């Protein structure tokens, strides 16, 4: 799928985006690739952080759905007017789709200064579309309207006055074998809403955290390209950081570093990678009592950032952080791996990325099988609110 190789760009820490066209004539927009949400939504009015935006009234193929939409996140919210239009991905498949589009008329802490994207492409399932699950997501429309197979795959590649440029590939409708090496291992999608999966064990430099495994998935574990960190439930974050602190303890950093709010630096090219431990997440296998591990390096979870005040140093931000809404395997995790979103077979594949950043002692790894007898169930069951219970689904 050569024409889709290297179709993503962005700034380190600010999202990976793909070029899309909406409307007739086609308006080009840079759109964030987000597997943690299910709306297609584009800036449609002026904003300090947007160079440009979708102008509905200039598209001869726009239809207004006469209905508004509102999505709040933990960080960020937007709102706008729903409609449909013609949408294509120039460096994607050679098709054109009529899809739902949310035209964002207002927003708060959503757009990111300097990120260069003007909208979001939510690739997850209808169950978490807003206003509700009858708003068909983009990928569902693409599959229904064209012959494109029901899978996509992501290779996110990690990196003085601007942040580092990043690149990646979104292969729509298949798997490109040049983007990985070694075995591709699949974990089932637990439920089709998020890309929810189940972590059964976590190791830091070979050592088990030894928590009840439901903690790893409290209250869910999801794969989200639009989240930049590996985010971990509070209790798991405190244990993991305790173990990383212990391994690295020849270096005493500020509190702010471990809080993800402060760089630490070494003389150029002298970063002591080998004092930071590898982190291994064991994911449920397709077979009962089987799992496989994805192992990331500090080159994934320490993000490079060039200090203006000390440009001769190599500086890093800690990109593991605390969550109250479950584990999020964000770009930090994904930057180790080629990730196959096999919606057709209700599973997610991982293989070692041909573009992952490593050194001569260590590599990001995908390894299995590992076997447990009489395994626990590690899934958490979210409390059902009456609101959620009252919804009909016809
Ligand atoms: O996780 C996510 O949506 C949850 C969700 C909540 C509510 C409805 C459906 C899904 C998406 C959206 C995301 C990163 N991924 C984030 O939450 N804020 C933010 C800010 C800017 C860009 C991307 C994001
Ligand atoms: Zn009903």
> What is 17-71 written as a DSSP string?
EEEEEETTTTEEEEEEEETT---EEEE-S--TT-S----GGG-TT-EEEEEEEEE
Distance CA 296, CA 27 (A): 39
77-88 and 97-108 strand pairing: antiparallel
Helix (H) or strand (E) holding 307: none
Greatest distance between any 2 Cα atoms in the chain: 64
Which of 36, 77, 132 gets mutated to test ligand 1 (max ligand atoms within 8 A of its CB)?
36
Closest of 224, 272, 266, 302 to residue 12, by C-alpha? 302
Q: Cβ(129)–Cβ(39) under 8 Å?
A: yes
Domain closes at, from 113, 148, 183: 148
Which of 85, 224, 314, 342 is catalytic? The answer is 224
DSSP string, 223-287: E-TT--SEEEEHHHHHHHHHHHHHHTTTS---HHHHTT---EEEETT---GGGSPPEEEEEE-SS
Task: Please give the order of strands across the beta sheet that includes 313-318.
Answer: 264-267, 313-318, 302-304
Distance CA 32, CA 8 (A): 9
The residue with tokens 């102008």 is 55
Residue 200 domain-assigned (yes or no): yes
Q: Cβ(11)–Cβ(18) under 8 Å?
A: no
Residue 2 domain-assigned (yes or no): no
Instruction: Please state, as a whole number, how many other Cβ atoms lie within 10 Å of the Cβ of residue 382.
Output: 11
Closest of 229, 354, 348 to residue 300, by C-alpha? 229
Residues 6+ apart with CB under 8 A from 91: 3, 4, 7, 18, 19
Residue 1 domain-assigned (yes or no): no
Helix (H) or strand (E) holding 300: helix 298-301
For residue 39, which atom of ligand 1 is closest to its CA? 9
What does R_g of the chain's alpha carbons equal in angstroms? 21
DSSP string, 135-167: S--HHHHHHHHS---S-EEEEEE----SPPEEE
290-296 and 279-284 strand pairing: antiparallel
CA distances 116 to 35, 43, 317, Å, are 19, 12, 21
CA distances 112 to 13, 55, 237, 244, Å, are 10, 20, 26, 30
CA 28 from centroid of its chain's CA atoms: 23
What's the gap in Å between 391 CA and the centre of ligand 2?
8
Q: Cβ(91)–Cβ(29) under 8 Å?
A: no
Instruction: Please state, as a whole number, how many other Cβ atoms lie within 10 Å of the Cβ of residue 376.
Output: 10
Beta bridge partners of 367: 293
Distance CA 340, CA 343 (A): 9
The 10 Å CB-count burial string (b at 16+, else e) for 256-272 is ebbeeeebbbeeeeebe
* Same domain, residue pair 64 and 212: no
Closest of 276, 200, 274 to residue 243, by C-alpha? 276
What's the gap in Å between 299 CA and the centre of ligand 1?
25
Residue 60 domain-assigned (yes or no): yes
* Same domain, residue pair 278 and 361: yes
Instruction: Please state, as a whole number, how many other Cβ atoms lie within 10 Å of the Cβ of residue 339.
Output: 27
The residue with tokens 């397709």 is 286
Distance CA 148, CA 1 (A): 13
Closest of 318, 339, 221, 205 to residue 265, by C-alpha? 318
Instruction: Please state, as a whole number, how many other Cβ atoms lie within 10 Å of the Cβ of residue 292.
Output: 22
Query: Domain holding 177: CATH number?
Result: 2.40.70.10
Q: Angle 333-107-87 (CA atoms, 0-180°, nearest 5)?
A: 70
Backbone angles phi, psi at 234, to 5 degrees: -45, -50
C-alpha neighbours within 13 Å on the C-beta side of residue 305: 18
* Same domain, residue pair 141 and 30: yes
Residue of minimum CA distance from atom 17 in ligand 1: 73
* Same domain, residue pair 330 and 206: yes
| Experimental technique behind these coordinates | X-ray
* Same domain, residue pair 256 and 374: yes
Catalytic residue flag (residue 176): no
Left (φ > 0), alpha (ψ -120 to 50) or beta: where does 40 sit? beta
For residue 111, which atom of ligand 1 is closest to its CA? 21
Residue 10 domain-assigned (yes or no): no
* Same domain, residue pair 162 and 106: no
The residue with tokens 């509905």 is 56
Number of domains forming the structure of the chain = 2
Domain closes at, from 102, 118, 148: 148
* Same domain, residue pair 70 and 180: no
Distance CA 344, CA 209 (A): 34
Residue 4 domain-assigned (yes or no): no
Q: Angle 327-187-137 (CA atoms, 0-180°, nearest 5)?
A: 75
Closest of 112, 106, 121 to residue 51, by C-alpha? 112
Q: Cβ(186)–Cβ(286) under 8 Å?
A: yes
Distance CA 383, CA 17 (A): 34
Residues 6+ apart with CB under 8 A from 242: none
Residue 7 domain-assigned (yes or no): no
**CA 284, 286, 292, 296 torsion-angle sign:** negative
* Same domain, residue pair 114 and 30: yes
* Same domain, residue pair 216 and 136: no
Which of 17, 38, 73 gets mutated to test ligand 1 (max ligand atoms within 8 A of its CB)?
73
Structural domain of 129: 16-148
Closest ligand (CA of 41): 1
Distance CA 43, CA 103 (A): 6
Closest of 220, 221, 218, 228 to residue 319, by C-alpha? 228
Residue of minimum CA distance from atom 13 in ligand 1: 226
* Same domain, residue pair 88 and 167: no
* Same domain, residue pair 193 and 299: yes
Residues 6+ apart with CB under 8 A from 381: none
Distance CA 270, CA 6 (A): 30
C-alpha neighbours within 13 Å on the C-beta side of residue 214: 6
* Same domain, residue pair 234 and 101: no
Which of 226, 325, 326 gets mutated to test ligand 1 (max ligand atoms within 8 A of its CB)?
226
What's the gap in Å between 59 CA and the centre of ligand 1?
28
Closest ligand (CA of 110): 1
Q: What does the DSSP 8-state code read for residue 2?
A: G
Catalytic residue flag (residue 34): yes
Residues 6+ apart with CB under 8 A from 288: 375
Q: Pocket residues for ligand 1 (CB within 6 Å)?
A: 32, 34, 36-37, 71, 73-76, 110, 120, 128, 130, 224, 226-227
Residues 6+ apart with CB under 8 A from 255: none
Which of 34, 85, 140, 342 is catalytic? The answer is 34
Q: What does the DSSP 8-state code read for residue 195?
A: B
C-alpha neighbours within 13 Å on the C-beta side of residue 307: 16
């Amino acid at each position: 799928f050569v024409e889709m190789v290297d179709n993503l760009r962005g700034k380190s820490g600010q999202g990976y985006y793909v070029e899309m066209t909406v409307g007739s004539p086609p308006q080009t927009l840079n759109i964030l690739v987000d597997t943690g949400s299910s709306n297609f939504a584009v800036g449609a009015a002026p904003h300090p952080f947007l160079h440009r935006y979708y102008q509905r009234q200039l598209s001869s193929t726009y239809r207004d759905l006469r209905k508004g939409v509102y999505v709040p996140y933990t960080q960020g919210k937007w709102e706008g007017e729903l409609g449909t239009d013609l949408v294509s991905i120039p460096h994607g498949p050679n098709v054109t789709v009529r899809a739902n589009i949310a035209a964002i008329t207002e927003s708060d802490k959503f757009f990111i200064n300097g990120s260069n994207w003007e909208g979001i492409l939510g690739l997850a399932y209808a169950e978490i579309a807003r206003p509700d699950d009858s708003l068909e997501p983009f990928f569902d429309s693409l599959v229904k309207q064209t012959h494109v197979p029901n899978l996509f795959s992501l290779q996110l590649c990690g990196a003085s006055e601007v942040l580092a440029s990043v690149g990646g590939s979104m292969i729509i409708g298949g798997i490109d074998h040049s983007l990985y090496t070694g075995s591709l291992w699949y974990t089932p999608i637990r439920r089709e809403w998020y890309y929810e999966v189940i972590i059964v064990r976590v190791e830091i430099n070979g050592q088990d955290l030894k928590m009840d495994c439901k903690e790893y998935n409290y209250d869910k574990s999801i794969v989200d390209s639009g989240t930049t960190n590996l985010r971990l439930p509070k209790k798991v974050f405190e244990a993991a950081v305790k173990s990383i602190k212990a391994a690295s303890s020849t270096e005493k950093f500020p509190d702010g570093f471990w809080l993800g709010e402060q760089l630490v630096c070494w003389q150029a090219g002298t970063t002591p990678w080998n004092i930071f431990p590898v982190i291994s997440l064991y994911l449920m296998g397709e077979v009962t009592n089987q799992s496989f591990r994805i192992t990331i390096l500090p080159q994934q979870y320490l993000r490079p950032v060039e200090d203006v005040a000390t440009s001769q140093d190599d500086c890093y931000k800690f990109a593991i952080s605390q969550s109250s809404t479950g584990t999020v395997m964000g770009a930090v995790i994904m930057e180790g791996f080629y990730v196959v979103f096999d919606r057709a077979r209700k599973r997610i594949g991982f293989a070692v990325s041909a573009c992952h950043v490593h050194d001569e002692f260590r590599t990001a790894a995908v390894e299995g099988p590992f076997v447990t007898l009489d395994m626990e169930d590690c899934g958490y069951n979210i409390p059902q609110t009456d609101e959620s219970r009252s919804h009909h689904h016809h």
